[PDB]
Amino acid sequence: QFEERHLKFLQQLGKGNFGSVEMCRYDPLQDNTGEVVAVKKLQHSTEEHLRDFEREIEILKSLQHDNIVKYKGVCYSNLKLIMEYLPYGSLRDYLQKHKERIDHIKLLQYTSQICKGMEYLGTKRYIHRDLATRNILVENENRVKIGDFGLTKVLPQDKEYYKVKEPGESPIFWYAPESLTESKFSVASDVWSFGVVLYELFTYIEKSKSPPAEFMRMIGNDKQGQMIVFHLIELLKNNGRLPRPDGCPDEIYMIMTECWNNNVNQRPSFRDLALRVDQIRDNMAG
Ligand SMILES: CNC(=O)c1cnc(N)c2cc(-c3ccc(S(=O)(=O)NC(C)(C)C)cc3)sc12
Structure with missing residues (x-):
């Protein structure tokens, strides 16, 4: 999986009433050689919302197609979905x-x-x-x-x-x-x-x-x-x-x-x- 500590925030990509996608750099070796990724997270975590987010993540994980964004992984502490940028x-x-x-x-x-x-x-x-x-x-x-x-x-x-x-x-x-x-x-x-x-x-x-x-x-x-x-x-x-x-x-x-x-x-x-x-x-x- 992706570690919290190694994901650097670069900028916000999208916002909503219950979501957000930010542009991040996953630099595990902290030597600026990591790739830039898109991270989506709930704007206001609610157990109801967290349950759906969980299903969403499974939906995307089950998809592999040239015209569907690629799933890269998840980030646990506040769940975070790591996708390709x-x-x-x-x-x-x-x-x-x-x-x-x-x-x-x-x-x-x-x-x-x-x-x-x-x-x-x-x-x-x-x-x-x-x-x-x-x-x-x-x-x-x-x-x-x-x-x-x-x-x-x-x-x-x-x-x-x-x-x-x-x-x-x-x-x-x-x-x-x-x-x-x-x-x-x-x-x-x-x-x-x-x-x-x-x-x-x-x-x-x-x-x-x-x-x-x-x-x-x-x-x-x-x-x-x-x-x-x-x-x-x-x-x-x-x-x-x-x-x-x-x-x-x-x-x-x-x-x-x-x-x-x-x-x-x-x-x-x-x-x-x-x-x-x-x-x-x-x-x-x-
Ligand atoms: C300049 N590059 C980018 O901006 C970029 C790069 N890589 C990505 N994977 C994405 C994904 C994006 C996105 C933007 C809005 C919505 S949404 O459907 O409106 N849902 C909310 C706002 C709640 C999150 C979904 C996904 S942008 C983007």
Whole structure:
């Protein structure tokens, strides 16, 4: 395992209401020859939260895939998860800061990798429940990985869905309708979220174009607080949806819209999604 005493803090990478990822240097020989790693820890340890963190760590440990962040180990005294440090960080920040270097063909390469990373999860009956460009990491120009599994749940053997309602704030603007109204999470709800990820990528993370910004405008910025979800549910029930990002090809937007089907069973699989995207990639290549 990794010793507490040998992990040097360098900087904070992410923060939340119950988590944090810091950039650290694991220098066991204290001779500045150790590698830099990412360490995630609970922002406010609660036994409930610690139990989930334990399961999260097992989830990631059971995953080994080119498009999934690598698990390096744990750190015991306050549990700490030691992962590989992807130098380009989140896809959300990367994309926003370097939009001039990333074209549509690249966005589709990232898109395809995310699909293969999600198909892999589904193969283990794992439901991510939190896909968003802020947890997709960039190893390099050409490689992205799903980098966080803090809300990931395993489907029970007898059901094709999982019900859960965790205390606090949820990323509602990425949630499928049945997840908002019924707290139901499945591969299909992951596909709904995937379509929001696709949207994100093609907006190049323009601040006014984010899902929250776009939905709040549709709902009405003069909105309340507990009633926000209620209105969001109505808006999606009447087929209201995120607009086609600027410069986004009609064939890409249709993939997004198909992922955003109210009919849970009518949404495409991650395999077919990879298929259509790779097809489009080729059609743009030659
Ligand atoms: C510049 N390089 C980096 O920044 C970097 C390098 N290596 C990594 N492995 C990671 C992982 C990151 C991350 C960031 C937010 C979330 S999150 O889903 O929002 N969850 C919280 C905030 C509660 C932790 C998950 C993971 S960034 C990053």
